[PDB]
Design a protein around this ligand. Structure first.
Ligand SMILES: NC(=O)c1ccc[n+]([C@@H]2O[C@H](COP(=O)([O-])OP(=O)(O)OC[C@H]3O[C@@H](n4cnc5c(N)ncnc54)[C@H](O)[C@@H]3O)[C@@H](O)[C@H]2O)c1
Ligand SMILES: NC(=O)c1ccc[n+]([C@@H]2O[C@H](COP(=O)([O-])OP(=O)(O)OC[C@H]3O[C@@H](n4cnc5c(N)ncnc54)[C@H](O)[C@@H]3O)[C@@H](O)[C@H]2O)c1
Ligand SMILES: O=c1ccn([C@@H]2O[C@H](COP(=O)(O)OP(=O)(O)O[C@H]3O[C@H](CO)[C@@H](O)[C@H](O)[C@H]3O)[C@@H](O)[C@H]2O)c(=O)[nH]1
Ligand SMILES: O=c1ccn([C@@H]2O[C@H](COP(=O)(O)OP(=O)(O)O[C@H]3O[C@H](CO)[C@@H](O)[C@H](O)[C@H]3O)[C@@H](O)[C@H]2O)c(=O)[nH]1
Lengths: 460, 458, 135
């Protein structure tokens, strides 16, 4: 009855950090070491202020770091001394070659695999842990099969993480379900059981689903695409609301009361973001094209096309509402993160709205509570960032002297802003573009204040 | 407080009929009369055997027919007498004009509004209650605006119906929500409250949604589109599973367990049928095209296209497995209804699979416990040469090359497959389009069957 | 194939000549170059300078190397791509080539020259793929 005592995780990211921190917290007698090549990131995980923002993570991490949980960058000894090894690195979409701008680049998963083999002896369980697993588990096993040592016995499992950034701790503390994939051998089922026992410390038996490696990845690929589809479906409906004169918040409620559909993920928005959804759908389309399933690839493609359209339509409305020029006009961008309560910008619609407006000559003022200043400048370029982009220290700075305020991220605090103060210093007429619906019910207040408030899924 | 006391309902179909029979049942003190042009149909609504099969429906109707609920062809008098007039007539898709085979025809709706006006005096609330409402309430209000009598005071309302056929009685007795669309006038809100108060007899107040006319019709369209998309998405995954050795049922479980997705409506199938989904999606597309939203049109069009693909892929697998020749080969089709526990065959998947096989010259033998023989011969119209309606499943499999399962009748598991296989031609194939035979796989294989099912391949 | 060493054995359009004009080796090389591979080309007769010319419009500087013998082209390589039927390629020491390759070690026989060598190469440990025949 193999029991896991030492866990090494390769990847100190939004997935790896939080996951292992909870595993450490819930399991005191099992030592968990998180390793990364990025010294900066590891130093931060060891300091008072962490490298990522996640509600509740500070308490989790500080309650068992140095008792039971470690951060090292010494990848070699952690691997050597471990029973289970997570691979939680990133898989960027390729920038050249076939599958450019679509297919996932497995160059880090492979390099990891290769290093494990170099530093491993005896038995070890290697589990692939990611948001979007694209032929991950197979790649690893392919490396291990071909690079065997004497008395080395490596098992490959799949274990896709379902956490959502912003609510990671809650999700990791109480997940809808846990998904472990491993070979339908007896070698095999034993490694699955041994990981199953890890989770059985805080997740009950019948919430842990055990299937085969591939099924597990296909399950994650599909699940991510279904959720992405809901957001796009309601976003499509939001477009229809605007041309006909209904409310998408109202239409969404009517929909959501059907228990077969359910009421979650029906908030219309400027466009879904994050390192998952788009990457997931593009890789699902690519997979399908490779298996000669054009019809299926054509079907899921629409989830991307619709998201693009949502972003582009919202943008045109801004320029449209400002007499078809924003040249030399000051515009405030409130919220830069892809979603609330996180520092992460990857694939954020704020990045897209900002760029589209800069191309029309707007002087932007960006504010976000938790996105670092340096990140914003990177995202927004590839010098024009010098001329047009300023980074504000508070919302009211971004708004002073501004022709319009664009809300891109549903930060709670945005509802709580002093709007009498903001209107007073804006140039008139002052516009608010709510790309998140966060200012519903506030309509009347804001109009009477003198605003021309334009929001998605509702047209004047 | 305007109190409704007499209800008339033009259209006694799979919607008009049950809905009214339940309204009547829930409210003893209010008279419900259901009218229809079709004489044959109205006589069946009064007879021991109803014109539609729907579980629970018989005990419900025969608890208040001739007492609170009446069924009559005398339309002109039910209207004259009623405070509330439901419009539950079918809207076939236009066979000609701009938007042939896409848009819905509003000629029956328009001839109702004309009939209403003639036989109407005083205040009356007119309510459009259908499953795919397309600009419906706006066509009615428009006829009312044009033809104005002295002291006529008609109020138009939208009350779409969320019942699923085969579980209609449950869905009506205990709905998820009721949706009432009225004009944002005070005239208006008085009209909405009266109807709201009819439902308050059995429906809790926080399950009744009040909105304007259009916001109600758009929500219905969306609502049916969202469900159809669910089936098509899991169907697409089924194709991908067959190409890669996974199981769509196992995948649907893992997907379903996410509380933000929901576990309902993720059963992969030969494809969705019903008088709703296909009509509903195509209409949404047509609207979007009309409003200059080609982006939105193309998106929802993928729900229909995936469904066409799933059906066609299923048809090809059958043909393929029989060496690409099915001339004079007996095939059993089990299940002609679009779903289980109904006799409705509108847009049924079994129609399309059947016709594909028929194009290959196959001799078809069809069985359904509830679908009228005549309905099958109409739906497939060659008929004389290839199609036979079987009176029991075993006479459909006697000497057949393949058994094809299209409807999820509970009677289809539990068949004596020992007996079926003995009299079948080998190789004996079973094509399970509904996953009804799950679990039984090993039994069927040792019996000697080659069992093929959607979302899983050898 | 970013940063992956791959040996290109043969660059001539066919055996017993140094002519490279419209050789498949130029295309296979360019396709693998677009993947960011580090190519090490060997040919017994094709001049070194002619190769770099055929592989040009800087991408060459970063990605191409010309090998003086086959064994340096394969030393630490991920795959051996045979593109020209030089008789010498059948005669190579594939025991030696393997011990210094990165695994999985691949041989892509574009010319069918390693026929009848398949069992020796498999037991040695190569995953040998050829045209006109698949696993
Ligand atoms: C993409 O992104 C998701 C991963 O999520 P995430 O937010 O954690 O990504 P992330 O970028 O936040 O985390 C990835 C981390 O892994 C580390 N890493 C990458 N390659 C490495 C290697 N070669 N050796 C050691 N460390 C390495 C990086 O330093 C990085 O900090 C995947 O699920 C996929 O969809
Ligand atoms: C169709 O299907 C959906 C609901 O299903 P359903 O059960 O109503 O369809 P159904 O066919 O069961 O009901 C249609 C009914 O409409 C009635 N009808 C049609 N034209 C009429 C007219 N000229 N005068 C009086 N009655 C007339 C008939 O009674 C018929 O039974 C609707 O949304 C619509 O799109
Ligand atoms: O109703 C909604 C919900 C979300 N979004 C947007 O979509 C994006 C994604 O949000 P979310 O899904 O919560 O963040 P993720 O961290 O990407 O998490 C999702 O994707 C993860 C992998 O990234 C899965 O593991 C999780 O289960 C799933 O919740 C955000 O930009 C949101 O604004 C909407 O527009 N409307
Ligand atoms: O997981 C599933 C569920 C259903 N179906 C099929 O989809 C079609 C339609 O199913 P169903 O929705 O149950 O029948 P409907 O009578 O069309 O009912 C739906 O459509 C109505 C409008 O027609 C709405 O009012 C209802 O709320 C909605 O449940 C049928 O052929 C089913 O077999 C599947 O293939 N897979």
């Amino acid at each position: 009855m193999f029991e896991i005592k030492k866990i090494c995780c390769i990847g100190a990211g939004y997935v790896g950090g939080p996951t292992c921190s909870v595993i450490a917290h819930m399991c005191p007698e099992i030592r968990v070491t998180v390793v990364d090549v990025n010294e900066s990131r590891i130093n931060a995980w060891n300091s008072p202020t962490l490298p990522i923002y996640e509600p509740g993570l500070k308490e989790v991490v500080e309650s068992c770091r140095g008792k039971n949980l470690f951060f090292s960058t010494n990848i070699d000894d952690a691997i050597k001394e471990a029973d289970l090894v997570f691979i939680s690195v990133n898989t960027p979409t390729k920038t050249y070659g076939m599958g450019k701008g679509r297919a996932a680049d497995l160059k880090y998963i492979e390099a990891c695999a290769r290093r494990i083999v170099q530093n491993s002896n005896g038995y070890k369980i290697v589990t692939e842990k990611s948001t979007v697993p694209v032929r991950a588990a197979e790649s690893i096993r392919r490396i291990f099969d071909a690079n065997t040592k004497p008395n080395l016995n490596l098992q490959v499992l799949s274990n896709p993480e379902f956490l959502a950034e912003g609510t990671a701790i809650k999700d990791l503390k109480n997940p809808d379900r846990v998904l472990i994939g491993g070979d339908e051998t007896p070698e095999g089922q034993r490694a699955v059981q041994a990981l199953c026992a890890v989770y059985e410390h805080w997740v009950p038996r019948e919430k842990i689903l055990t299937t085969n490696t591939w099924s597990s990845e296909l399950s994650k690929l599909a699940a991510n695409a279904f959720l992405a589809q809901r957001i796009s479906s309601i976003n499509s409906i939001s477009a229809l609301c605007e041309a006909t004169g209904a409310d998408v918040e109202e239409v969404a409620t009517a929909i959501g009361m059907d228990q077969r559909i359910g009421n979650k993920f029906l908030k219309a928005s400027v466009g879904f973001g994050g390192s998952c959804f788009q990457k997931d759908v593009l890789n699902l389309v690519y997979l399908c094209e490779a298996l000669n399933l054009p019809e299926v690839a054509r079907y899921w493609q629409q989830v991307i096309d619709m998201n693009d359209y949502q972003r582009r339509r919202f943008a045109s409305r801004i320029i449209d509402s400002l007499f078809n020029t924003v040249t030399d006009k000051k515009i405030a961008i409130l919220g830069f993160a892809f979603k609330k309560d996180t520092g992460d910008t990857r694939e954020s619609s704020s990045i897209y709205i900002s760029k589209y407006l800069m191309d029309e000559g707007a002087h932007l003022h960006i504010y976000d509570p938790k996105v670092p200043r340096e990140q914003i400048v990177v995202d927004l370029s590839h010098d024009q960032v010098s001329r047009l982009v300023t980074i504000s220290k508070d919302p009211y700075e971004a708004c002073d002297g501004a022709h319009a305020v664009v809300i891109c991220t549903e930060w709670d605090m945005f509802k709580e802003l002093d709007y009498e103060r903001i209107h007073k210093k804006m140039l008139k007429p002052a516009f608010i573009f709510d790309g998140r619906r966060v200012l519903d019910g506030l309509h009347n207040e804001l109009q009477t204040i003198g605003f021309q408030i334009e929001t998605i899924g509702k047209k004047v």
